[PDB]
Structures are given as structure tokens and as C-alpha cells.
Design an enzyme around this catalytic site. Structure first.
Site, PDB file in Angstrom:
ATOM      1  N   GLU A  35       0.857  -1.201   0.000  1.00 39.30           N
ATOM      2  CA  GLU A  35       0.000   0.000   0.000  1.00 39.30           C
ATOM      3  C   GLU A  35       0.888   1.244   0.000  1.00 39.30           C
ATOM      4  O   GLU A  35       0.633   2.213  -0.762  1.00 39.30           O
ATOM      5  CB  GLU A  35      -0.988   0.047   1.189  1.00 39.30           C
ATOM      6  CG  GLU A  35      -2.102  -1.071   1.182  1.00 39.30           C
ATOM      7  CD  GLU A  35      -3.112  -0.947  -0.007  1.00 39.30           C
ATOM      8  OE1 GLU A  35      -3.098   0.095  -0.673  1.00 39.30           O
ATOM      9  OE2 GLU A  35      -3.920  -1.872  -0.228  1.00 39.30           O
ATOM     10  N   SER A  50     -11.916  10.443  -4.347  1.00 41.13           N
ATOM     11  CA  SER A  50     -11.485  10.117  -3.013  1.00 41.13           C
ATOM     12  C   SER A  50      -9.940  10.073  -3.024  1.00 41.13           C
ATOM     13  O   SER A  50      -9.285  10.102  -4.094  1.00 41.13           O
ATOM     14  CB  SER A  50     -12.079   8.783  -2.511  1.00 41.13           C
ATOM     15  OG  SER A  50     -11.679   7.710  -3.378  1.00 41.13           O
TER      16      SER A  50
END
Ligand SMILES: [Cl-]
Ligand SMILES: [Cl-]
Ligand SMILES: [Cl-]
Ligand SMILES: [Cl-]
Ligand SMILES: [Cl-]
Ligand SMILES: [Cl-]
Ligand SMILES: [Cl-]
Ligand SMILES: [Cl-]
Ligand code: NA
Length: 129
Positions: A35, A50
Site C-alpha cells: 500500500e 477520493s
């Protein structure tokens, strides 16, 4: 802050993530690796407007408030900025709510695609834990 592998494992453990909802510490370390490459300051815009924030790339669509994601929720009750801190407490508390939401760690698409089913214990191998 860019964490080292064992350093992040030890911080995750300290904050009670190890085997949280049944996910061993190597799962959490692997998800953070893919990530954010372990960088607490990582941010990534999504096509829908987002943004994903921090070592675990938590999405403003649901979990935090950044003030620029129309119609979004803030279920962790925090500014998305709190997720970029060198101290991982806010990230960890929010990840616990995320992984409890029903789909476990599948909420993290890089965990599903890159960690799930793999030898995740490698991530904590050799760490004084
Ligand atoms: Cl590494
Ligand atoms: Cl593990
Ligand atoms: Cl917003
Ligand atoms: Cl902006
Ligand atoms: Cl909300
Ligand atoms: Cl806020
Ligand atoms: Cl920390
Ligand atoms: Cl699960
Ligand atoms: Na939000």
C-alpha cells in the site's frame, strides 16, 4: 516517516494489530509494504475523487474526512491528515474498524492481490518481536 520492516512489525504489535480479527502480523506488514512502501506520508488520488492516506492507504470515501470527497463518510471519526502521522496509532485504530466491516483484509485491494495466500510470515522473519 519511512518505516523499516521489523520496525513497523514492532509498532503494529505494540498497537495490538498482531492477529487482530485473525490476521497475523505478517499480513499487516505485507499490506503496508504494497500500500505505502512503509511510508506514513503516502497519499494517492482515486479516479472517483477520493484519496487514500498513510501506511495502510485508508480511503476518504468511507473512513476519514478530507473535506474534498463529496457524499463520503468519516467512519473512523478523524481528519485524513491524522493518518499521515509518524506515530501509527490513528492508522491502526482505523484499520481495526476497516477489517471488522465484513470483508476482512480484502478491503485492501493490494493485500488481496499481493499478500493473500502468500508466505506472509516472510515479512516478520528475523524480527525481534
Ligand atoms: Cl522490506
Ligand atoms: Cl505472519
Ligand atoms: Cl468530504
Ligand atoms: Cl484539493
Ligand atoms: Cl460518518
Ligand atoms: Cl476533520
Ligand atoms: Cl508508531
Ligand atoms: Cl476474515
Ligand atoms: Na470522508
Amino acid at each position: 516517516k519511512v518505516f523499516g520492516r521489523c520496525e513497523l512489525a514492532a509498532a503494529m504489535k505494540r498497537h495490538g494489530l498482531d492477529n487482530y480479527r485473525g490476521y497475523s502480523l505478517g499480513n499487516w506488514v505485507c499490506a503496508a509494504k504494497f500500500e505505502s512502501n512503509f511510508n506514513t506520508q503516502a497519499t494517492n488520488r482515486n479516479t472517483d475523487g477520493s484519496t487514500d492516506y498513510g501506511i495502510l492507504q485508508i480511503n476518504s470515501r468511507w473512513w476519514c474526512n478530507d473535506g474534498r470527497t463529496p457524499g463520503s463518510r468519516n467512519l473512523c471519526n478523524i481528519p485524513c491528515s491524522a493518518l499521515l502521522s509518524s506515530d501509527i496509532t490513528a492508522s491502526v485504530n482505523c484499520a481495526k474498524k476497516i477489517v471488522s466491516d465484513g470483508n476482512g483484509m480484502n478491503a485492501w485491494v493490494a493485500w488481496r492481490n499481493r499478500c493473500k495466500g502468500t508466505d506472509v510470515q516472510a515479512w516478520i522473519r528475523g524480527c525481534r518481536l
